[PDB]
Design a protein around this ligand. Sequence first.
Ligand SMILES: *[C@@H]1O[C@H](CO)[C@@H](O[C@@H]2O[C@H](CO)[C@@H](O[C@@H]3O[C@H](CO)[C@@H](O)[C@H](O)[C@@H]3O)[C@H](O)[C@H]2NC(C)=O)[C@H](O)[C@H]1NC(C)=O
Ligand SMILES: *[C@@H]1O[C@H](CO)[C@@H](O[C@@H]2O[C@H](CO)[C@@H](O[C@H]3O[C@H](CO)[C@@H](O)[C@H](O)[C@@H]3O)[C@H](O)[C@H]2NC(C)=O)[C@H](O)[C@H]1NC(C)=O
Ligand SMILES: [O-][O-]
Ligand SMILES: [Cu+2]
Ligand SMILES: [Cu+2]
Ligand SMILES: [Cu+2]
Ligand SMILES: [Cu+2]
Ligand code: NA
Ligand code: NA
Length: 497
Amino acid sequence: AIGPVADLTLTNAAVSPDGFSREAVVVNGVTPAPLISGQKGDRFQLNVIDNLTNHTMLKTTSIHWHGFFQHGTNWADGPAFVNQCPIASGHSFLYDFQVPDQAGTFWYHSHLSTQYCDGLRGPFVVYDPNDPQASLYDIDNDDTVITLADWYHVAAKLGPRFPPGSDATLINGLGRSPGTTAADLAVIKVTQGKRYRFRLVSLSCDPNHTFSIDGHTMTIIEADSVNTQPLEVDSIQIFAAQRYSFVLDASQPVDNYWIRANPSFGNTGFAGGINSAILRYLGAPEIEPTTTQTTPTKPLTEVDLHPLTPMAVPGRPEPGGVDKPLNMVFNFNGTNFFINNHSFVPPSVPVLLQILSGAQAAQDLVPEGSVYVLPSNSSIEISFPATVNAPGAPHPFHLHGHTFAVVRSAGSSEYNYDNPIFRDVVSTGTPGDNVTIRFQTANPGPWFLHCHIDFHLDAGFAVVMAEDTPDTTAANPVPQAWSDLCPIYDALDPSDL
Ligand SMILES: *[C@@H]1O[C@H](CO)[C@@H](O[C@@H]2O[C@H](CO)[C@@H](O[C@@H]3O[C@H](CO)[C@@H](O)[C@H](O)[C@@H]3O)[C@H](O)[C@H]2NC(C)=O)[C@H](O)[C@H]1NC(C)=O
Ligand SMILES: *[C@@H]1O[C@H](CO)[C@@H](O[C@@H]2O[C@H](CO)[C@@H](O[C@H]3O[C@H](CO)[C@@H](O)[C@H](O)[C@@H]3O)[C@H](O)[C@H]2NC(C)=O)[C@H](O)[C@H]1NC(C)=O
Ligand SMILES: [O-][O-]
Ligand SMILES: [Cu+2]
Ligand SMILES: [Cu+2]
Ligand SMILES: [Cu+2]
Ligand SMILES: [Cu+2]
Ligand code: NA
Ligand code: NA
């Protein structure tokens, strides 16, 4: 794969991942965007060259590298109007950052409006040459990344504000829609007797997926970017922007087996081979599977996930047992989402630039009421109680700049302050749940916190966690190219956005 040093050229082109042709935003000619890779310790230099021509899908752009801490490079995190102004068509911008202390499965996507839905989204893997899970598998390479993407026949700005699911699920970029049931399916090849580390990446804009493979079980070894104690499952509900690594032991008879990714809404089930791909053992005929679904007897539950390496939960083991507890009260008015009575509206001056110019207190940062200032070196607890006032649940929330402990998961009344999973995207569940996370503020800068259903983010379901505002400017020296983005963007005609 490309990386750690690469050009990512953005253009508009016609694609037919499910046999239906539509115009899209592509990266180096393709959507999903190509796999980027490197290894622990690398300096990534990803030069984003914006050659977009289509205003309906936005000619401007910004790229976020999902899951990376970006310590001291907050300016490269990507969210438009939080960490930078968007890049303009005919221009380039170099994202230059290091990953000294993380490895795992990540992804990358546009972080401007709903542009990632129109195609700017792909996988990103940082390999660990001393991976502690490596004795569990034989093969871990570019052909073991499995992407899931909800694909729409109508563009994000042309269809409904809140689409009722997608036309197709794409698995490694290919899939069928109900009207294109002869379109080519993705094929994942295995050799009998080998063990594979599959890296499952949800590139979804909205629906979650229930993933399974006929005749096979899956051993989870990683959740988002965090290594887990090996957990055997036979079904995985994966929410938008989550990842899992699992080991597959290709010990079944030589045959074709259905891979299934059933969306929570949209075109559900498997009629005509929608929501499906093919696991093909080497030597099997090159035809569609005729395997049948079996009821899961070991579905993934988040509470069964624990970190491989002990990871201490911040604070003391009781509710509110931290320096700064916060409760996020969700609402919706039919058009806009709200957190604590505020719907995020992106500011003209990016939040990071406001802070560099001297705005360090929440009352002086805009948009007011959506920016929370957190003290440095402190324990934080955030609760996200599900509510009928925020439809479109379960909302999968994501915190930039951090992995966090999930002390209470969806569908569980337990609080685990001992060995809960840490991750970066968590389902907030349905009414009755009170999903709760903890983390420590060791990462100066403004970090977005939002629902990763992109239509909801765009309708304002977000806040900014401005951590350690007093050391933010010193900790994140910016390049001139970043300073230059706002004047370029602010000069554009409305028709060239
Ligand atoms: C979801 O979980 C959060 C966090 O536990 C809940 O917020 C917390 O709610 C309790 C009330 O049960 C608040 O405690 C109260 O504090 C006041 C003084 O401030 C005291 O007089 C009461 O005796 C009680 O101890 C707590 O402050 C509050 N935490 C935050 C950060 O707001 C939330 O209510 C839960 N939501 C649902 C729907 O379950
Ligand atoms: C710029 O990107 C746009 C979004 O992908 C793309 O929009 C496409 O616009 C046409 C209408 O001009 C839509 O086609 C329609 O017309 C057919 C009959 O030929 C009917 O089925 C419907 O009336 C339908 O609305 C496309 O649906 C729409 N594409 C998407 C994905 O929404 C523009 O075409 C792009 N501009 C250029 C110059 O390529
Ligand atoms: O990821 O936003
Ligand atoms: Cu993301
Ligand atoms: Cu992110
Ligand atoms: Cu949402
Ligand atoms: Cu984000
Ligand atoms: Na690479
Ligand atoms: Na990791």
